[PDB]
Structures are given as C-alpha cells and as structure tokens.
C-alpha cells in the first residue's frame, strides 16, 4: 500500500511546475530504476496502465513501462514478477479502456514477449479471441501487437493465422484494415526470408481487397495502405510478379481519378515508381509499366496554376517553387527517378509518343508539362537522347515564343537541363542554336520569370562551355544581363549577378575586356538585401579570378575594404568566406597580410561541436521535419543531430584546407591549432561522416605546411595514431578509405621511418579488422529480390600497405605475417582476388617469401589467363617482379610461364591496354634476369609489344632494357611514342644508331611526324 502512493504521487507529479515535477523525475531515475526497485516500479506502472481510472496516469505509465522495460531489461526480471506483470497487462487490455490507452497497453505487452522469455500462451489466446471481437479497437490493437512482435505470427497455427489476415484485409473498419496491412508487411520486415513463403501467399487477397477503398471513397486509408505496400516492394519486389499488371493498372486508375485528394494519388505514384528502384528487370520486361508510368506522370505535370489560366499568381511571384503544386512536383521527381533506373532504351519511345502530341495541344498546361517531362527524363534517357539532339531542339525551340509565358519558362527549362545533362557535347555542337534562343528571352519584352529562367539556363550552359565557344556571344550576353541587373525585382537582379559570375568564370581571360564596364556597377551595388550583396561579391571575385591578378588589382583594395566592412558589421557569412578564399587564390602570397582578418571566423565555424540532443521516441519524427536536422538510433537510444551546422563545419574545414594548400609554409603558424582543435577532434565525429573525412584530408596538408616552414614530429605521431585507431572503429567503408589515403599522404609527407613499431602493429590489427568486415559484408551478395564502395576501400588499403612497407624499408614484412590467413582466403570473388594479388606484388618487392611461393603461384598462374584483365595485370606484374627482386628462388616458374605471357600479350584495346603492358614488361624482366640462359625468339616477340604508353613504371623498364637493322624506324617511333604520350636516356642510345646512317637516311625517319610533334622532337634530340 505504501509503495503505491509513493509511486502514484511521483507519476502524477509528471504532469504539471518544475519543482514537484523535477523531484519526481530524480526520484524515478535515481531511486526507482535500480537493481532493488525496478520490478516494483514496473509492477506499479503496468498496474496503473491496466487499472487506473485516470486517463493521463494510465497513458503515461504505459509509455514509461515500455521505455523502462527495455532498459531493465525484461530478461533480468524474476519469473514470479514477469508473470504478474504479464497477467495484469493482459487483464487491462481485455477490460474497458480508451483507444489510445489500449494502444499503449499493446505496446507495453509487446515489451513482455521475447525469444529468451517464458512462453505466454494466455496472450496468444487473448489475441485470437480479440481479433474476432466486435470492437474494432480490439481487432486493430491485436494486429498492432503482431506488428511489434511478428514472432507471434509464427506461434499461431498456420490455418488460423492465414484467415486472420484475410479477414483483416477485408474488415469493415478502415483502422483494422490499415493495421492488418501494417502487421502483414511488418512480418517481412522482421523475420528471416526463409519464413517469408509462409505468408507470401496472402499477397493476392491483399491486392484484391484494394478496389474496395475506391468504392467506399476511402482514399486517406488507401494512402496508408499504399505506404505499407511501398515498404513491401523494397523488401520483396518479386512477390508482386504474378499480379504486376493488376497493381500497375490499379495505381493508374487511382491517379487518373482527379476528384481524389492528393495523398492517395501521390502515394500511388510512389508505389509505381519504387518498382523501378527495386525490380528493374521486372519493370523492363513489361511494356505496360513504362507506358503507365509515363502517362500518369504526364497527367500530374499538368496540374499547375489551377483556376488561374493567365498564371497571374505565378507571374507575380519569385523564382521559387510553389509549394501548393504538390502532385506536379511529385510527378517530375518520379519520372526522373524511373528514367535514372531504367534508361532511354526502355522509356524514350513511350515518352516521346506523348510529347510529340502534347507540344501541339491548345491547352498550355500540356505544352508546359511536355517541357518539364523532357527536362526530368533527359538525364536518365541520355544514352539514347544524347544522339538525337537536333531533333530535340527542333521540338523545343519553336516553343520559346509560345503565347503563354509559363510554356516559355518551360522551354528555357529544357535548354538549361540538357545543357547540363548532355555536356560537354551539346556546348560544342548546339551553341549556335541554344545561346541565341536563351539570349532572346533576356530582353525586357519578356516576363520577369522568363528572363530569369533563361538567365538560369545560361548558368547550366556556361558551366561546360569553353571560353572560345562563349567568346562571340559575350558582348550580347553581357549587355542583356546588365539590363536584368536594373530590375525592380530583387530575384531578377540576383539571377542576373549569378549568370554574369558564371559566364565570367567560363570566359576566363576572354572576359578581360568586360571588366571595366562591370566592376563599377558591382562596386556601386555593394556600397549602397543580403543575398544581393553576397552574390555581388561572388560576382566580383569570380570576375577577379577570370581576369587575373594584374587586372584584379585595379579594384582589389577598394573591394577588400568593402568586404571587411561587410564581415564585421547569415547567408552573407558564407558568400563572404568564399570570396575571401577566392581572393587568396588570386593574390597568392600577397594575401598573407589578410590572414588575421579572415582566419578567426573560420576557426569559430570549424570548431563546431557534435551538436547532439539525447532525445525521446515520440519527440523525434517532428524533429525530423526540419531539413537541418536528422535523428538516428545508434545503440538503442534516440539522438538528434544538427546536420546543417556540421555541413558548415566541413565547408569551413575545406576552406582552411585550401588556405593551407595555397599558402604552404605561410600557414604554418596555424597548423598546431587547427591540428589539435579541428582536424583531430573531427575523427571522433561518429554522427557525421563528412566531418570525419574532412578532418582526415586536413591532416597531411597541415603537416606539409609546418614541414615547409619537434612539434611536427609530435603532431605527426598524434595524427597517425588517431588515424590508425580509426581503422578498428570506423563503421563506414567510404571513410575507412579516406583514413588509409590520409595515412598514405601523411607518410609521403613525413618521409623515412615515420612510424614506430607499436604503430606498425596497431596498423596491422586495423588492416585486419578492415579486411575481416569487408569479407563479412561481401559474403552477403534471390527468390524475392533482383559495391565499388568495397572495391575502392581495398584499393586504398593496397596503397597504405605499400606506403608502410616503403617507410619501414621492409621491416613491415614481420607484422604483415599476421594477416596471411586473411590474404590467403582472398586469393581463392574477383575484387578480393585482385586485392590479394596486388598485396603479393608489394611483398616480393622487399627471396624471403619462399615460405609462400607454394601457397600462391598455383593461383597466380591460373590468374594469368583469367577473363578478367585486372587479374591478369596484377598476376603478370607479380611474375615480373619475381624475376626482379627474387631472381633465383623463382626461375622454375618464370621461364615456363614465359610462353603464356607471349600469348596473354596477344589485347591492344583501351580497357586492357594496361594489362597487356604489364605482361610485356614482365617478359622483358625475365629476359633480363636470365639473359643468355634462355631457350631469343622471345626478344623479337617482346619488341612487337612496343610501344608502352600507359603504365609509367613498366615503360620505365622497357626503355631502359631497349637502351642496352631496318627496325630503325620502329626503334625511334617506339621512343617518340612513349615520350609524346608522356609514359616515360634511351635517346642517347638512339642518337648513336642514327649516327650509323647517311645524312638522308637519318632525316627521313621523322618524315612521318606532324609539325607539333616535330617541335618536341627538335627539343628532345
């Protein structure tokens, strides 16, 4: 009795005042959640939720019990008490409770069902009977429990559970249906695939139940069902195979019914779209999918400016998206997503069938839709469309002058989108059509929105246009954009500025002659609307970099004085930082005196802490609404992380990094500070990988700055050690790669013997944990379903090992022995194989490997003739390196294989020109090691593999060997080719050979060579 009113007072104190409520909070956490009181507390809260006549106490207790029962956890609760808790929870559930309390009871009950927990067959019985209750809330609540605890589905007899769900799908109550569908999908969510076939057979009942929602006009409930179905498509797309046409046709039917509210229609579209992302082969094998998908997104794209045919409201607004045009926005993203998954082969035809027709409609909305659809699809359909580019402009460009301004904006949109998506080929070949088209829209004759969008599209075009292509168009581009600069509308001016900036960036030195007109107009705008000023300083400094320092000097001082005023006076802050940074690229070392102005603010931003809020289950989701926040669950609990702030930290770190890169020795004074207060702490930012990576790349660059100008040695020890330590903790494979790369770059900077023996040992463990977890993730990649990330990581591990070998000067062989099992497993899935071979090549570089000759040559010799070029490459290099560093413990292999090599050689094609060049070098190595001991055809074979133009270290050997007939023209050319291709003293050898021939015989060899390479030849000989 006592315990009860203590606890009762506490929980009642929760609703309320700080004092009474804080006393209760402490009491709960410090006194009641302890080994000694936990079961009393859980017992209490279960009893309150079950029996309390007060709504709020009941609700709260149910929630608290749920939370605390995890943490306990339920497993360490005494059997007698579990049972009592179970029985009261259950009695409460079966009693008369408000809906939301039964929900919370259900959630509490779920915490009491567990693999290790004793069977609770009274629950099973309660659920079965509740499912048949005439009270919807009982039925709904039971499916909810089967959602939280899908294992219970396995526990019921299969012939009971099946009709339970079938009744569920078909229930009179919407709520019950939604919960049945939720429970049904939850099963697949939670259980192994080997359990899936047991409920999979229910899919047709579910699909067949769906037309009922449209009959009754229950579209909100439809949307929820569509959301469950979307999750099921991501889990088991192939389950939908047999009834694919029916679900396609159904989503079609919903979307077209445009008396329905948006949610049913947007979720139906999503359902359709998501098949392309999870079962592409399925979509592609069915012409109906593509046709339906195109047709419905085209319908939805026309849903703009409704009830406003003149677009007055659109004409009058800024250049942002109208948040009321939801289905339009959805349609665009969907077409884009499917095009990107399926390609043009499959969608262009159906797409264009419709566009040809919509371009000609008298309804403007359809002519617009056409342009926006093309815009959405062009990237994904590039494989086909990139070739039919005159045809596309023939459709679009006529519309640039449509009576309706929104159709015009639409056409500008396409010219913009494709300038990006088909770049750089479109800039080269359609400039003569695209630029005049966009330039004509800049005139003040057109509407603000159109002038702006045409100027936006000129950013897309410019980004990939060489200065020479833009040159004849600059005066025209510029005179027009100046007028836009004089607009009354802020967004027109802001666009004008950005377009000029980016045109100047592309124009480079060709912009020098426009600088005197622009620069004063820009200075005037600044001396006077935050974004205007920012875009204005951005325009100024991009012009500055375009024209170079000398020209920039006519206004740099004044510009700098304005920036100072601006900086010390929120989107502006970021334009300011970029501008200062760009001035540092212009001014070079002359920036040094400005570091004390510019660096302090960067230090503040780059010192941002991992802004975490240890957060509550409910209190998430709505925290998630904000683009600037995310929530995850890491080790059970919920964490709110301020994402934007951490993006900004990265951006600042990238600027510090770029100052350090440009200023070299002159940045040294900041190295210790940035290293200890920014780079290093950033590795411990487990919630944001950008930070971790940005911290990593900063390290070698900081070291290199201090080098150029004891401390250095300390910092490197600290930095390398945290890098190394990151290898055994870092969860994200892409980051792990950055660390290895970062070590490589560190080692390269620091030089000889930069690592200590313990570090070398700690590295090895990290290398092993990395290899182990890569193996484990990869041995995971079906009945129900249709990774360079991994390849890239292994690529870099190769580099770090190599780098470590080199700094240790061999000594790392010792440590390298511990991961030989690991290496060996890899050697005998192509990516792991390539890796292994690459490692072995490095090993030999430092005849102490005999211990393993027998363990690998069997696989290497196999690999030589592999269908895979990357394997042959790595293999041959190994055999060649054998004859170089281990001449004698390897002969029985090298000379036999030698015929294999003459065959692998025979190939000379971009994709494998690299592999055959290694083999070529590999045979020249064998010919060297065992020079007059060979059974000589060989050398004349080898020669016919010249020239070597791609692999540099290979080329380096071959021409060294060449430097030790009427082959004379092929001798020379073999060299000119290597030089000219910049792949590789053999010159000295050659001049002597040309000595052995007349005036006229000598000259004639170069007779084939064009002017430009004869310039080089003169400067080589």
């Amino acid at each position: 009795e006592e315990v009860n009113r203590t606890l009762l007072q506490i929980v009642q104190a929760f609703a309320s005042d700080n004092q009474i409520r804080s006393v209760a909070e402490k009491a709960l956490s410090e006194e009641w959640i302890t080994e000694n009181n936990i079961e009393y507390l859980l017992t209490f809260l279960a009893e309150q939720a079950a029996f309390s006549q007060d709504t709020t106490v009941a609700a709260l207790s149910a929630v608290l019990f749920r939370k605390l029962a995890l943490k306990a956890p339920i497993t360490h609760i005494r059997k007698e008490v579990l049972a009592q808790i179970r029985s009261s929870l259950l009695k409460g559930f079966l009693s008369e409770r408000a809906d939301s309390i039964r929900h919370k009871l259900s959630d509490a009950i779920a915490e009491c069902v567990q693999d290790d927990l004793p069977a609770w067959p009274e629950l099973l019985q309660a659920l079965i009977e509740s499912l048949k209750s005439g009270n919807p809330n009982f039925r709904e609540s039971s499916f909810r429990i089967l959602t939280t605890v899908p294992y219970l589905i396995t526990a019921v007899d299969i012939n009971s559970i099946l009709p339970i769900f079938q009744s569920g799908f078909t229930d009179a109550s919407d709520n019950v249906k939604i919960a049945a569908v939720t429970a049904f999908v939850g099963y697949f969510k939670q259980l192994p695939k080997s359990e899936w076939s047991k409920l999979g057979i229910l899919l047709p009942s579910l699909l067949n139940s769906l037309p009922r929602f449209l009959d009754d006009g229950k579209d909100d409930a439809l949307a929820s069902v569509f959301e469950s179905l979307i999750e099921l498509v991501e889990l088991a797309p192939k389950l939908f195979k047999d009834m694919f046409d029916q679900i396609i046709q159904f989503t079609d039917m919903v979307i077209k019914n445009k008396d329905l509210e948006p949610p049913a229609r947007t979720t139906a579209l999503e359902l359709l779209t998501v098949f392309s992302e999870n079962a592409p082969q399925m979509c592609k094998s069915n012409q109906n999918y593509g046709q339906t998908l195109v047709m419905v997104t085209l319908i939805m794209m026309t849903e703009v400016s409704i009830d406003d045919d003149d677009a007055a409201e659109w004409i009058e607004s800024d250049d942002t998206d109208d948040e009321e045009e939801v289905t339009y926005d959805h349609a665009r993203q969907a077409l884009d997503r499917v095009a990107l998954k399926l390609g043009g082969e499959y969608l262009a035809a159906p797409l264009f069938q419709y566009l040809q027709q919509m371009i000609t409609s008298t309804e403007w909305r359809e002519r617009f839709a056409a342009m926006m659809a093309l815009s959405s699809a062009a990237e994904g359909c590039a494989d086909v469309l990139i070739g039919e580019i005159p045809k596309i402009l023939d459709m679009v460009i006529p519309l640039i002058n449509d009576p309706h301004p929104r159709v015009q904006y639409g056409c500008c949109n396409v010219l913009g989108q494709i300038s990006t998506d088909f770049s750089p080929f479109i800039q080269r070949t359609a400039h003569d059509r695209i630029l005049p088209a966009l330039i004509s829209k800049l005139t003040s004759e057109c509407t603000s929105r159109v002038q702006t969008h045409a100027a936006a599209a000129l950013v897309n075009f410019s980004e990939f246009a060489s200065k020479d292509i833009l040159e004849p168009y600059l005066d025209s581009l510029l005179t027009n954009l100046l007028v836009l600069l004089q607009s009354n509308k802020l967004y027109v001016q802001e666009q004008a500025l950005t377009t000029i900036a980016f045109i100047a960036e592309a124009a480079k030195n060709k912009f020098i002659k426009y600088y005197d007109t622009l620069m004063p107009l820009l200075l005037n705008v600044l001396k006077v609307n935050s974004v205007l000023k920012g875009k204005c300083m951005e325009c100024a400094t991009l012009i500055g970099f375009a024209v170079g320092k000398e020209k920039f000097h006519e206004h740099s001082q004044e510009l700098i004085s304005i920036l100072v005023a601006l900086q010390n006076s929120d989107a502006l802050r970021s334009y300011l930082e970029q501008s200062w940074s760009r001035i540092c690229r212009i001014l070079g070392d002359d920036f040094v005196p400005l570091l004390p102005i510019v660096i302090p603010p960067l230090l503040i931003t780059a010192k941002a802490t991992q802004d975490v809020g240890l957060i509550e289950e409910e209190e998430a989701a709505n925290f998630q609404q904000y683009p600037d926040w995310d929530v995850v669950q890491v080790q059970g609990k919920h964490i709110a992380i301020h994402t934007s702030v951490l993006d900004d930290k990265v951006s600042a770190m990238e600027l510090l990094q770029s100052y350090a890169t440009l200023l070299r020795g002159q940045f040294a004074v900041y190295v210790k500070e940035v290293m200890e207060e920014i780079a290093l702490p950033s590795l411990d930012f487990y919630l944001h990988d950008g930070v971790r990576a940005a911290g990593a790349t900063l390290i070698p660059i900081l070291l290199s700055c201090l080098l150029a100008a004891e401390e250095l040695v300390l910092l490197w020890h600290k930095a390398s050690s945290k890098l190394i330590g990151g290898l055994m903790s870092e969860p994200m494979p892409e980051i792990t790669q950055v660390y290895h790369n970062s070590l490589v770059n560190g080692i390269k900077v620091m030089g000889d013997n930069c690592l200590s023996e313990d570090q070398l040992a700690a590295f090895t463990k990290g290398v092993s944990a990395n290899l182990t977890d890569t193996y484990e993730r990869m041995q995971d990649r079906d009945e129900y379903n249709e990774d360079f990330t991994d390849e890239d990581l292994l690529d870099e591990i190769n580099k770090s090992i190599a780098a470590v070998l080199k700094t240790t000067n061999g000594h790392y062989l010792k440590n390298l022995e511990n991961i030989w099992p690991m290496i060996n497993t890899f050697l005998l899935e192509p990516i792991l194989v390539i890796f292994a071979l690459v490692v072995i090549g490095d090993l030999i570089q430092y005849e102490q490997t005999a211990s393993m000759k027998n363990a690998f040559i069997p696989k290497v010799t196999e690999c030589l003739i592999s269908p895979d070029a990357r394997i042959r490459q790595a293999a041959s290099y190994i055999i060649g390196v054998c004859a170089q560093y281990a001449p004698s413990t390897y002969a029985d292999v090298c000379i036999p294989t030698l015929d294999t090599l003459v065959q692998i050689v025979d190939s000379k094609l971009e994709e494998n020109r690299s592999s055959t060049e290694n083999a070529s070098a590999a045979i020249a190595k064998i010919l060297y090691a065992y020079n007059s001991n060979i059974p000589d055809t060989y050398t004349a074979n080898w020669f016919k593999t010249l020239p070597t133009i791609t692999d540099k270290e290979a080329a380096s050997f071959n021409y060294q060997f060449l430097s030790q007939q009427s082959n004379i023209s092929a001798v020379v050319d073999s060299v000119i080719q290597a030089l000219n291709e910049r792949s590789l003293t053999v010159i000295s050898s050659v001049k002597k050979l040309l000595g052995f021939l007349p005036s006229s015989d000598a000259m004639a060899i170069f007779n084939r060579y064009p002017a430009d390479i004869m310039e080089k030849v003169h400067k080589w000989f």
């Binding site: 884009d336 990006t420 969008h453 897309n460």
Partner: peptide, 10 residues
Amino acid sequence: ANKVTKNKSN
C-alpha cells in the same frame, strides 16, 4: 537558387 536543376525528395 540559381541554375536549372531538378529537386530530390526520394
């Protein structure tokens, strides 16, 4: 803001 692009809520 301030090129021609397509947005993304996937």
